[PDB]
């Protein structure tokens, strides 16, 4: 008979794991937004690589609500809406599916089916101007409860009752925007904390933000399976002194056979060899 | 088939630093996330302190800082180093392979491991205290010859009521540790009211760790 | 956060019965729950995942149910290996994967009665300084019996700890053993030690006491 060697492993690689994805600005900038005016950003049409999210300042929270925080890089999501806003310390626990209060009841309320990850961290150095940075406001005294992902940027004077107040303020009348005091004198729980709530919408339509490719290693001098770049195959991999002119991806011999793959994400001249 | 060894051991003192390990044997170490569950004898499977292939390293808020997870695919094992431990980390540590369904998100921690053990106290020599049921003011035909082994520590201790003459009796009571830090079990035997007068019913102890095979009857 | 209130701690059972283990959440966690089984002296294993999808190897009518906050492990048929501690785990929690409190499904027999014996400490134990009086409560199925160390007609407890062994194999009863740990002066000055056995098994609480 004719006994051969069967491919030991199935180590493969892909042309660059991921592309440039905008996981900054809503995650890393200066002035963010305000609770009353939650921002938004529909990231799509890009290979979502959530690895940059982890290599960031020790955060004060990473609670994922519905999705395993370890499988974000492997689930094809349809849309992801990043929402950034700066709240205080005692309000970090209020932003969560099913929790009420006064900063998540009328300012920003998440549904009871919110399949996302809330990310919070301390910002007592970038958004803590002395004497109190009064630029941030938080909405209060809403006529009714808020809805999942509902904006409230009105500034009409609201009163408790039986008090005419249209454009002027008073004792029982106040504007629906109150400043936040960000001073180092204030203890923990009153400092500014930035929160970005990635809302991963899970559906059945073609996903526009899939996770990065599973490019493995480059086991050499050992018979293995191959998917380098996109062609499938099987064989041993050596190191050749050939010089594919800067454009030639695959290689070929005098028999129309794949015989030299180019390191997808390492720009190198490997040479495929037969598994006897 | 698919086992998870947990050869880490533990005998640290307050303020020590032990290092555990969980080496798999039966699947892609890479394509799987290894956590670390903990069970206090008399409590519920605790936190996770999980590690991931994307280099994600998770911790508990009440264990963060004094903990550091590390995945090393070279030897197909992970590690769990801890800083100064208090008196509340004495428990049976475990390592699990938390996984969800294909693209579904139901983490079901399916492949559990062996069982590492941590302690943070001292030890002593077994103090056997005989209990004589000479007062037959009992229910009649029911003797309860017991030997209270007190002031010892390592759980591996056994109270052979005579090999062979153990005769379906040895009731090894769970070591009731006195706050001190010394353990105290108990072992009564199911003997008739005349067996308290039949043969040398001895409570041969066998304290192994502190090295003291001790004996004596009642 | 998201808590889970499993069934009351002790769930009596017979080899064949409809056992209901309730797991109620503080929110609407939809269909994110995992049921486990931890037998005494071994590592836990998965039984029901994603509310109703049994994993594998769990086939003994270990049916799950529920799709909101309250979920129930309907065990319609029980075997010796269907007895042990059960745990719930809301997958809707992620970073702090929180497990349940624990529900021990035990076996059932009849009602019994405590065969007891107060046990004065060793002679040399007092010269050692210490002392240990033991109240053996043996052969009792209703494991709710308490120990009241009555030193000289006074409830001078606080230092006596007790424990129970694993449920007997062919007897199904439990065994209790408290240890009155006091000093030598506290022993050679007192004479009444009635161990009040307030158990549901016996009709009248028996109090055995030794005298010096």
Domain end point (choices C105, C134, C167): C105
> Tokens standing for C172?
């199904």
Domain boundaries, given as residue ranges, for chain A: 1-17+213-276, 18-212
Count Cβ atoms within 10 A of the Cβ of residue A221 and give its class: 0-12 exposed, 13-18 middle, 19 or more buried.
exposed
- C115-119: strand order across its sheet: C115-119, C133-140, C174-180
- Method used to solve the structure: cryo-EM
Phi and psi at C85, nearest 5°, equal -90, 140
How far apart are the C-alpha atoms of B206 and B212, rounded to whole Å? 7
Give all strands (DSSP E) within chain C, no chain letters.
4-5, 10-11, 19-25, 35-38, 45-49, 53-54, 62-63, 70-75, 84-88, 103-105, 115-119, 133-140, 146-151, 174-180, 193-198, 207-208
How far apart are the C-alpha atoms of B125 and B207, rounded to whole Å? 8
Count of C-beta atoms within a 10 Å radius of residue A244: 15
Nearest to B118, CA basis, from B158, B74, B86: B86
CB A15 within 8 A of CB A264: yes
Which uninterrupted H or E stretch holds C59?
none
How far apart are the C-alpha atoms of C91 and C99, rounded to whole Å? 10
CATH of the domain at C14: 2.60.40.10
Q: Nearest by CB to C97, which of B48, B112, B135?
A: B48
* Bridge partners for A121 per DSSP: A194
Residue C110 lies in a domain: no
Which are the contacts of C12, defined by CB distance < 8 A and separation ≥ 6? C106, C107, C108
> Tokens standing for C138?
């043996």
- C127 and C94 both lie in a single domain: no
DSSP conformational letter for A51: H
How far apart are the C-alpha atoms of A86 and A83, rounded to whole Å? 10
- C201 and C141 both lie in a single domain: yes
Tokens 């294993």 label which residue? C45
Domain count, chain C: 2
How far apart are the C-alpha atoms of B38 and B47, rounded to whole Å? 7
Query: If DSSP codes are grouped into helix, strand and coil, which group holds residue B187?
Result: strand
How far apart are the C-alpha atoms of A100 and A120, rounded to whole Å? 18
Nearest to C176, CA basis, from C160, C155, C153: C160
Phi and psi at B184, nearest 5°, equal -150, 105
Q: What domains can be seen in chain B, in order of their start residue? A: 1-120 (2.60.40.10), 122-218 (2.60.40.10)
Task: Tell me which architecture the domain covering A18-212 has in CATH.
Answer: 2-Layer Sandwich (3.30)
Contact C94 A66 (CB under 8 A): yes
How far apart are the C-alpha atoms of A139 and A178, rounded to whole Å? 7
- C97 and C124 both lie in a single domain: no
Nearest residue in chain B measured CA to CA from C89:
B108
Contact B139 C132 (CB under 8 A): no
Domain end point (choices C57, C80, C105): C105
Instruction: Give chain A's contact residues with C (Cβ, < 8 Å).
Output: 62-69, 97-98, 112-113, 117
Contact C94 A98 (CB under 8 A): no
Count of C-beta atoms within a 10 Å radius of residue B215: 13
Q: Which residues of B touch A55 (CB under 8 A)?
A: 55
Contact B105 A69 (CB under 8 A): no
CB A196 within 8 A of CB A29: no
CB B216 within 8 A of CB B177: no
Domain that holds residue C193: 115-208
Domain end point (choices C105, C126, C160): C105
């Amino acid at each position: 008979s004719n006994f051969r060697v069967q491919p030991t492993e199935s180590i493969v690689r892909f042309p660059n794991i991921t592309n440039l994805c905008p996981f900054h600005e809503v995650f890393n900038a200066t002035t963010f937004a305000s609770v009353y005016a939650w921002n938004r950003k529909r990231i799509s049409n890009c290979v979502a690589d959530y690895s940059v999210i982890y290599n960031f300042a020790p955060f004060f929270a990473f609670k994922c609500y519905g999705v395993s925080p370890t499988k974000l890089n492997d689930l094809c999501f349809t849309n992801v809406y990043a929402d950034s806003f700066v709240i205080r310390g005692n309000e970090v626990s209020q932003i969560a599916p099913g929790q009420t209060g006064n900063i998540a009841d009328y300012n920003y309320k998440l549904p009871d089916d919110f399949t996302g990850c809330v990310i919070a961290w301390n910002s007592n150095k970038l958004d803590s101007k002395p004497s109190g940075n009064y630029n941030y406001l938080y909405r209060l005294f809403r006529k009714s409860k808020l809805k999942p992902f509902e904006r409230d940027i009105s500034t009409e004077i609201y009163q408790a009752g039986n008090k005419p107040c249209n454009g002027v303020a008073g004792s029982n009348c106040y504007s629906p925007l109150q400043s936040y005091g960000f001073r180092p004198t204030y203890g923990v729980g009153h400092q500014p904390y930035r929160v970005v709530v990635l809302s991963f919408e899970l559906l059945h339509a073609p996903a526009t933000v899939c996770g990065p490719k599973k490019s493995t290693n480059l086991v050499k001098n050992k018979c293995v399976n191959f998917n380098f770049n996109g062609l499938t195959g099987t064989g041993v991999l050596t190191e050749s002194n050939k010089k594919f002119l800067p454009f030639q991806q695959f290689g070929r011999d005098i028999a129309d056979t794949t015989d030299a793959v180019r390191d997808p994400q390492t720009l190198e001249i490997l040479d495929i060899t037969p598994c006897s | 088939e698919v086992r998870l060894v947990e050869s880490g051991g533990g005998l640290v003192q307050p303020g020590g630093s032990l290092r555990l390990s969980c080496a798999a044997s039966g699947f892609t170490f890479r394509n799987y996330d290894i956590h670390w569950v903990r069970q206090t004898t008399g409590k519920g499977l605790e936190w996770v302190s999980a590690v991931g292939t994307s280099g994600d390293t998770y911790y508990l808020d009440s264990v963060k800082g004094r903990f550091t997870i590390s995945r090393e695919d070279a030897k197909k094992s992970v590690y769990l180093q801890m800083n100064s431990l208090r008196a509340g980390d004495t428990a049976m540590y475990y390592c699990v392979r938390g996984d969800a369904s294909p693209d579904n998100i139901y983490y079901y921690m399916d492949v559990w491991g062996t069982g590492t053990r941590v302690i943070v106290s001292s030890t002593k020599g077994p103090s056997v205290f005989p209990l004589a049921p000479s007062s037959k003011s009992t229910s009649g035909g029911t003797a309860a010859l017991g030997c209270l082994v007190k002031d010892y520590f390592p759980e591996p201790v056994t109270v052979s009521w005579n090999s062979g003459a153990l005769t379906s009796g040895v009731h090894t009571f769970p070591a009731v540790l006195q706050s001190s830090g010394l353990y105290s079990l108990s072992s009564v035997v199911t003997v008739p009211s005349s067996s308290l007068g039949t043969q040398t019913y001895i409570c041969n102890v066998n304290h192994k760790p502190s090295n003291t095979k001790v004996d004596k009857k009642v | 956060d998201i808590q889970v209130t499993q069934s009351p701690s002790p769930l009596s059972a017979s080899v064949g019965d409809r056992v209901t283990i309730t797991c109620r959440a503080s929110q609407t966690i939809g269909k994110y729950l995992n049921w486990y089984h931890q037998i005494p002296g071994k590592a836990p294993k998965l039984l029901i995942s994603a509310a109703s999808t049994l994993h594998s190897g769990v086939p003994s009518r270990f049916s799950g149910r529920g799709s909101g906050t309250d979920f129930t492990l309907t065990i319609s048929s029980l075997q010796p290996e269907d007895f042990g501690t059960y745990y719930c785990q809301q997958s809707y929690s992620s970073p702090p994967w929180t497990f349940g409190q624990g529900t021990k499904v035990e076996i059932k027999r009849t009602v019994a009665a405590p065969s007891v014996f107060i046990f004065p400490p060793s002679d040399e134990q007092l010269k050692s300084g210490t002392a240990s009086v033991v109240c053996l409560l043996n052969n009792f199925y209703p494991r709710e019996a308490k120990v009241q160390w009555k030193v000289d007609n006074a409830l001078q407890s606080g230092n006596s700890q007790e424990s129970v062994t694993e449920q007997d194999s062919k007897d199904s009863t439990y065994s209790l053993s408290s240890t009155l740990t006091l000093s030598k002066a506290d022993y050679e000055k007192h004479k009444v030690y009635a161990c009040e056995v307030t158990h549901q098994g016996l009709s009248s609480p028996v109090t055995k006491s030794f005298n010096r």
